[PDB]
């Protein structure tokens, strides 16, 4: 009867229609809902529990400069900034920190280092003057936080009252037994119920961008649940 | 010699009779990349925390969208899957290959047990995002259990006879 | 929709960007403020096990360690910013920690000395010393977290709403 | 002077640098050779538990690291380069060992899956699999290692001289 | 607040009134480098596992010749060394300062039990080779016991009143 | 009574007297006596126990080069080479494989890597034509034993028979308990008898060259043993 899957982002067991996606927003800080899965017409049920089901979910941000004749080899952020669980080194990091591209130049762009203080990151390459460019930093000083919806867009609860900081999602290194993380709550639902991930964080995410090196899509969300059947 | 015990301790890998592979597109969820199946007269087992280990590749030589998805699933004879029995449906993310097979923190089990009689599949389903790469048979690679070592498990094969 | 009506002894941490803690910048040979103050909320009762996890994440303001000689002291304090000797916990120094591993290694993860509790008005401060001549802590960087939920690894803190149990108030002059 | 009369079960090691082991160099998808060969001293007795410790560590020519869908199979053999499929153990691939911590680290560190024995006058063989458009083996930088002496960790390999003992022909026999 | 118990647990270190060091030079093994004394009416404890942890430095910010020698050990009073009861007797190699406190493997344990009466000294000889640089106290430090802590012991500390 | 003592190779206990050190021969293989250790007068006994004691051994050798116009940065070896406790990387080593001194320049050289596979290494500076250089790089390919002598240079037995290899004894890393290196076999002596710790191998090993940085004695030894006073 009862199996443990994985859900993502697209497809996978429900089929690219019953999931959907979404940005936050900016200027009015408010708990949008990024990701929400409505429970096919398929299945029984679906449970969900903390501390028995794993769990990840990488975001990013965009942002973007402009080339100019001076050698810039650094660039500014409007995003708190530190490292994939720390560390001042880069390609030792579970993923990279951040990524960068060169519209004219369709090619990748390493990384040296950052100060991981302030809004910073360095560039090894040596971009040329109005050339465009493209950056998928990490993404700092969010909430997330579950709800449930019941066909109608029509709330009745919350799986956990308090939200776990994306901050704190980071920082522990992941897909590790023992650190894994397994955050709080016991939910289920059926029918073309819903469950949404709601975001409340100031910067801009993303899911697609067409022009992204390591992978279609950027972010990712790979979250552990029970099914019947 | 000391008569070992019938229920050996084997682990699976790409050579082999009763394995096969074939090359995969993108959004091709039915067809199986890997098939499996029981050899003549043998029973296998697969406990629940059996580990597994994909090393699907690019043909250039890469990684593919770690968003990719891969099932391991049990099926009736005649190519037919179920919906009992599956088990092992995990993204193509989130495995560090360089640590994956050598560190046990980073290998990663199963979650059910299994059971493989005589004449039976046991198909393993890849799901790429569209406008990606194919999978390459060439340097994919699959393995599960985990012979000679102190951590995870060991595939049990056992003669019917 | 359903959901299961989880106990009350609910398994929390804690974090700078919460409204009932507040931190400020620190100079140098400093010991009588505290760096970072916590309060409890109204209605409300915090329990900190003793073998709960500590982890200060301090920085220099130009992104760096500091002088690892320096010297952190949780402690709690009577109402009015009174502290007390007794139930103080966790007197350690800066250094020592790995930072990078800390609170992921069971191994780095420091846990306290002896049991705490807070009852709803009640304050818990984390005094400072840094010796001179030194560079001082910059509270943008700076961090604290106590608890360990999300992990079979460490101790959570416990929390309570006051008005739902009746020895709630019981355990609360119990201390 | 004084020394202790060590009992004879003495706790040992194998390596390449002994008299009764030997290598040759091996090309690709080439099962057949041993590339080391073990033989066992006259009048002695080696004993290899189940739970021993193994450590292939072999090389390119180069100084690199092989495919690691390479294979590695310990084998007994009867006398006369005769293999035999029951007694066999480590089946292992050339790959996941992270030769770097392989020894040092109890987790890395693989053991063999059943008993062995090895009377007076008999052969073990490492056979090695390397699929074809590769490199080949080097026997100047190559090696292997068994058991565990000087470590809490792992187990050693136990020796015995066949003439000290009365039932060592009955364990011989026994195998 | 909990009563907490007289048997309270404590961790030392160069800032405190009770020890003093003195910068040494070269083969002067009768000089202690640090000096330790039972304040009045306390007794100390220091079990057999407590952890030690010396970090002397060169005038110039550099370690020593790792050949170097160090020593704790207890004296009766008025400076009097004794046989018995000594414990760590170490080589100033062999700890790697970096990974030394935080690491518990590269943690260093005594070797057997120890006390303090409320008059009494232990002292921390160190024998430097000739034709090497001096000791500065002024980078030096000493720490004993890890308070705070899982792995390690603290030095027990009670009132003897 | 009992105690548990360091003893190194210098000093220490006994008093720069009851030591004696030497170096070993090249040319005809042979169980040379590199160390040994005499139980001074004061002494009641001294034992030595396996699988009780610690132990650690750093060992190396000399050899010497001759600048030249061309920019060399490697030099080769006569000595079977290979990382301490195997990395490709130099400064995560517990220590420096190699170390290098120019006489012209009296100044540190750095190491950047090897090949570790034939006797090679690299050097990172660039040393000019007619300078003088020395280099203590690792030692291989050798075994070390133990026996006692009753005051007489004249052997009574054997500590254990078979010889452990100093290159397996660089291979583990040392001074880890659980990896800590411990020995067998179960002596003990008494007064003016020695333990001789003996070494066969072929490069010549060293104890003292008197311009070495990392220290004034370059190799080392420090055994853990057991006192009755």
Same mark, same amino acid.
């Given at each position: 009867?009862?199996?443990?899957?994985?859900?993502?982002?697209?497809?996978?067991?429900?089929?690219?229609?019953?999931?959907?996606?979404?940005?936050?927003?900016?200027? *009015?800080?408010?708990?949008?809902?990024?990701?929400?899965?409505?429970?096919?017409?398929?299945?029984?049920?679906?449970?969900?529990?903390?501390?028995?089901?794993?769990?990840?979910?990488?975001?990013?941000?965009?942002?973007?400069?402009?080339?100019?004749?001076?050698?810039?080899?650094? #660039?500014?952020?409007?995003?708190?900034?530190? %490292?994939?669980?720390?560390?001042?080194?880069?390609?030792?990091?579970?993923?990279?920190?951040?990524?960068?591209?060169?519209?004219?130049?369709?090619?990748? #762009?390493?990384?040296?280092?950052?100060?991981?203080?302030?809004?910073?990151?360095?560039?090894? !390459?040596?971009?040329?003057?109005?050339?465009?460019?493209?950056?998928? %930093?990490?993404?700092?000083? @969010?909430?997330?936080?579950? &709800?449930?919806?019941?066909?109608?867009?029509?709330?009745?609860?919350?799986?956990? %009252?308090?939200?776990? *900081?994306?901050?704190?999602? +980071?920082?522990?290194?992941?897909?590790?037994?023992?650190?894994?993380?397994?955050?709080?709550?016991? /939910?289920?639902?059926?029918?073309?119920?819903?469950?949404?991930?709601?975001?409340?964080?100031?910067?801009?995410?993303?899911?697609?961008?067409?022009?992204?090196?390591? @992978?279609?899509?950027?972010? !990712?969300?790979?979250?552990?649940?029970?099914?019947?059947? | 010699?000391?008569?070992?015990?019938?229920?050996?301790?084997?682990?699976?890998?790409?050579?082999?009779?009763?394995?096969?592979?074939?090359?995969?597109?993108?959004?091709?969820?039915?067809? %199986?990349?890997?098939?499996?199946?029981?050899?003549?007269?043998?029973?296998? /087992?697969?406990?629940?925390? !059996? *580990?597994?280990?994909?090393?699907?590749?690019?043909?250039?030589?890469?990684?593919?969208?770690?968003? !990719? &998805?891969?099932?391991?699933?049990?099926?009736?004879?005649?190519?037919?899957?179920? @919906?009992?029995?599956?088990?092992?449906?995990?993204?193509?993310? &989130?495995?560090?290959?360089?640590?994956?097979?050598?560190?046990?923190?980073?290998?990663?089990?199963?979650?059910?047990?299994?059971?493989?009689?005589?004449?039976?599949?046991?198909?393993?389903? #890849?799901?790429?995002?569209?406008?990606?790469? @194919?999978?390459?048979?060439?340097?994919? &690679?699959?393995?599960?259990?985990?012979?000679?070592?102190?951590?995870?498990? /060991?595939?049990?094969?056992?003669? +019917?006879?």
């Amino acid at each position: 009867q009862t199996q443990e899957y994985t859900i993502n982002h697209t497809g996978g067991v429900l089929g690219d229609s019953y999931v959907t996606t979404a940005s936050n927003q900016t200027s *009015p800080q408010r708990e949008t809902a990024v990701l929400s899965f409505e429970c096919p017409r398929k299945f029984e049920e679906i449970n969900y529990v903390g501390q028995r089901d794993a769990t990840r979910f990488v975001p990013r941000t965009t942002e973007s400069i402009t080339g100019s004749a001076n050698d810039d080899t650094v #660039v500014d952020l409007t995003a708190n900034i530190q %490292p994939v669980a720390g560390e001042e080194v880069i390609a030792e990091q579970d993923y990279p920190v951040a990524v960068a591209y060169n519209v004219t130049q369709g090619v990748e #762009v390493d990384v040296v280092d950052a100060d991981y203080a302030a809004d910073t990151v360095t560039l090894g !390459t040596n971009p040329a003057d109005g050339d465009e460019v493209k950056v998928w %930093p990490i993404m700092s000083d @969010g909430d997330v936080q579950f &709800r449930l919806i019941n066909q109608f867009g029509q709330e009745e609860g919350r799986v956990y %009252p308090w939200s776990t *900081p994306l901050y704190r999602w +980071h920082d522990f290194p992941q897909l590790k037994r023992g650190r894994e993380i397994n955050l709080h709550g016991s /939910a289920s639902w059926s029918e073309n119920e819903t469950l949404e991930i709601l975001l409340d964080a100031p910067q801009a995410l993303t899911w697609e961008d067409s022009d992204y090196p390591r @992978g279609q899509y950027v972010t !990712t969300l790979e979250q552990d649940v029970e099914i019947t059947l | 010699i000391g008569n070992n015990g019938a229920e050996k301790q084997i682990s699976l890998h790409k050579g082999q009779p009763f394995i096969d592979t074939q090359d995969v597109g993108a959004a091709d969820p039915n067809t %199986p990349a890997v098939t499996i199946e029981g050899p003549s007269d043998y029973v296998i /087992a697969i406990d629940a925390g !059996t *580990p597994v280990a994909p090393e699907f590749r690019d043909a250039n030589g890469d990684k593919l969208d770690p968003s !990719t &998805r891969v099932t391991i699933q049990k099926c009736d004879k005649q190519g037919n899957p179920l @919906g009992d029995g599956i088990v092992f449906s995990d993204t193509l993310g &989130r495995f560090e290959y360089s640590k994956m097979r050598s560190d046990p923190d980073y290998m990663r089990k199963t979650t059910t047990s299994l059971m493989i009689d005589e004449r039976e599949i046991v198909k393993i389903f #890849v799901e790429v995002p569209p406008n990606a790469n @194919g999978m390459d048979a060439d340097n994919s &690679r699959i393995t599960i259990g985990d012979d000679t070592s102190d951590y995870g498990k /060991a595939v049990g094969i056992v003669e +019917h006879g």
